[PDB]
Design brief:
- The PDB classes it as transport protein.
- This protein is mostly helical.
- It has one domain: Up-down Bundle (Amino acid/polyamine transporter I).
- The chain contains 24 helices and two strands.
- The protein has a two-stranded antiparallel ribbon.
- Strand 1 and strand 2 form a beta hairpin.
- Helix 9 crosses helix 13, helix 14 packs antiparallel against helix 15 and helix 19 runs parallel beside helix 21.
- The longest helix has 34 residues.
- It starts with a helix and ends with a helix.
- The chain binds Bupropion and chloride ion.
- Bupropion binds next to helix 2 and helix 15.
């Protein structure tokens, strides 16, 4: 049964709320395969090596995201940056989980609220395909019963004029978020241990849901056109860099790299655990799952396009909520729709709780390895972190909360996470030493990494990461939500949010340089040498001050 534990771990870590909620709308907004080509390319080239590197670092050093930088003290700033990114991304993940909980609560009925309009939340402009024969010519529709429900009875978005009029928190999403927060705190207040029990059903269910989605949606009146549009590549779309930026960000979202979660999780792994097999299996399963999810999503929205007599590009929204408009629509066409709705939204709740727990545990471990006081008081520290997250998510459940959620989803971990991962790779590979990293991996697992891994770690991955980071800055599209154009100050606030975590690296480098005592060269030596080898500095034996270290692969 040794292989069973391994397989369970890899399947559980290979599926995330990212793959199930963020990948659908990114794939739909970016062509639908013109997004997969960059996705697969980046997956291999950058995601596999960086996932492997993070796992190996966490395993060997036995430290969290922040404290693992005792190998190179100058990058504790990068550690703090990834911790802050994980904290930022934890303000709207809980809001998404609250939406899932609300949908699950609404699913306990024999007449689902998203099947037709005629309720209190339905506008006069609703069009029901079943109650009638069947437009702005470029809009995102918004007049379907499912979209009407999502945007009026759940978000109450019709009571906000923009991000400048967010309003007051909704008292229903308020209770949902309170329940989610309480569950997270009570699942994180005792310790890191949560595996080897009920996590069995939080990893198998997503695959069953995806499988049933495929088998059913393949046989739909309009799924053929959706599949055809999915399998058509538009290279003029590939010549824009928006798809490339989205692919990189979604990759680092789904694989978990750049959030400090992998390092913290691996810090508890057995010293002789195989990170290479972990990386290979997780990446392969992630790629296959992403392809299948794209196929199912495009089949469903092709069916919608056939049902609403609307072009495929206008059936559904291109932002957060695409899954909440899609899955109800597909469920309404299944026999016994109530059971399937319950199962689907229970799966969404389980996945979201698992992901939120992972991120919160990453933050807590990163900040607790640094300070012993917080380690001795896990309960109070967890309560404080959870309360802060609860308030900053309260900010995102207002009437105009979708605008804030879009701003965060766009700016919290975009160029910021790309820069953090680039700095991690540069730090390790160049300053600490790819040769030293390979020696550590050999000491741990028994075999030295191949040439492909070393080349990707040292040259290729940093190069493409830097290219994407530069392109995402020189080619920045002002934020928008469907047909709503954010005001310029919203863009300024988003860029400030990104910089808040991007600037911790140079600030910490400056702080470390000033704090250390000695001359310039001595300060540099203490700054780039591992903490446990500071005795060599007095002997004037620094490897980084030799060309052999820099010209070694
Ligand atoms: C991407 C991450 N999940 C892993 C690392 C892939 C397991 C996640 O969903 C997350 C990241 C930061 C904060 C919060 Cl709340 C959630
Ligand atoms: Cl993904």
């Amino acid at each position: 049964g040794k292989k069973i534990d391994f397989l369970l771990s890899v399947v559980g870590f290979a599926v995330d709320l990212a793959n199930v909620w963020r990948f659908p709308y990114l794939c739909y907004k970016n062509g639908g395969g013109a997004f997969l080509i960059p996705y697969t390319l980046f997956l291999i080239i950058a995601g596999m090596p960086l996932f492997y590197m993070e796992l190996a670092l966490g395993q060997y050093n036995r430290e969290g995201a922040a404290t693992v930088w005792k190998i190179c003290p100058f990058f504790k700033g990068v550690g703090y940056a990834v911790i802050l990114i994980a904290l930022y991304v934890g303000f709207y993940y809980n809001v998404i989980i609250a939406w899932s909980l609300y949908y699950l609560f609404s699913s306990f009925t024999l007449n689902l609220p998203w099947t037709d309009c005629g309720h209190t939340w339905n506008s006069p402009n609703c069009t029901d395909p079943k109650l009638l024969n069947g437009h702005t010519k470029y809009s995102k529709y918004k007049f379907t019963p499912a979209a009407e429900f999502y945007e009026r009875g759940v978000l109450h978005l019709h009571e906000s004029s923009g991000i400048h009029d967010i309003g007051l928190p909704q008292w229903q999403l308020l209770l949902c978020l309170m329940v989610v927060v309480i569950v997270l705190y009570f699942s994180l207040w005792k310790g890191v241990k949560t595996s080897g029990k009920v996590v069995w059903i939080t990893a198998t269910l997503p695959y069953f849901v995806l499988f049933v989605l495929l088998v059913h949606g393949v046989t739909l009146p309009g799924a053929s056109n959706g599949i055809n549009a999915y399998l058509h590549i538009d290279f003029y779309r590939l010549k824009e860099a928006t798809v490339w930026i989205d692919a990189a960000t979604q990759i680092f979202f789904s694989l978990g790299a750049g959030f400090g979660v992998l390092i913290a999780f691996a810090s508890y792994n057995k010293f002789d655990n195989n990170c290479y097999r972990d990386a290979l299996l997780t990446s392969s399963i992630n790629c296959i799952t992403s392809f299948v999810s794209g196929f199912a999503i495009f089949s469903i929205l092709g069916y919608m396009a056939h049902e609403h007599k609307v072009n495929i590009e206008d059936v559904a929204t291109e932002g957060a909520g695409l899954v909440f408009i899609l899955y109800p629509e597909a469920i309404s066409t299944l026999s016994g729709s109530t059971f399937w709705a319950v199962v689907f939204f229970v799966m969404l709740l389980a996945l979201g709780l698992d992901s939120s727990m992972g991120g919160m545990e990453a933050v807590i471990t990163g900040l607790a390895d640094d300070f012993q006081v917080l380690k001795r008081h896990r309960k109070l520290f967890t309560f404080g972190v959870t309360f802060s997250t609860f308030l900053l998510a309260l900010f995102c459940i207002t009437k105009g909360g979708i605008y804030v959620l879009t701003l965060l989803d766009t700016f919290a971990a975009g160029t910021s996470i790309l820069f953090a991962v680039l700095m991690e790779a540069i730090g390790v590979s160049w300053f600490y030493g790819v040769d030293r990293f390979s020696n550590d991996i050999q000491q741990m697992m028994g075999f030295r990494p191949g040439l492909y891994w070393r080349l990707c770690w040292k040259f290729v991955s940093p190069a493409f990461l830097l290219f994407v980071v530069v392109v995402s800055i020189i080619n920045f599209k002002p934020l928008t939500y469907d047909d709503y154009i954010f005001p310029p100050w919203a863009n300024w606030v988003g860029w400030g949010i990104a910089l808040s975590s991007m600037v911790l690296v140079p600030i910490y480098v400056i702080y470390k340089f000033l704090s250390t005592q000695g001359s310039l060269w001595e300060r540099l030596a203490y700054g780039i040498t591992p903490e446990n080898e500071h005795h060599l500095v007095a002997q004037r034996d620094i490897r980084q001050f030799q060309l052999q270290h820099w010209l070694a692969i």
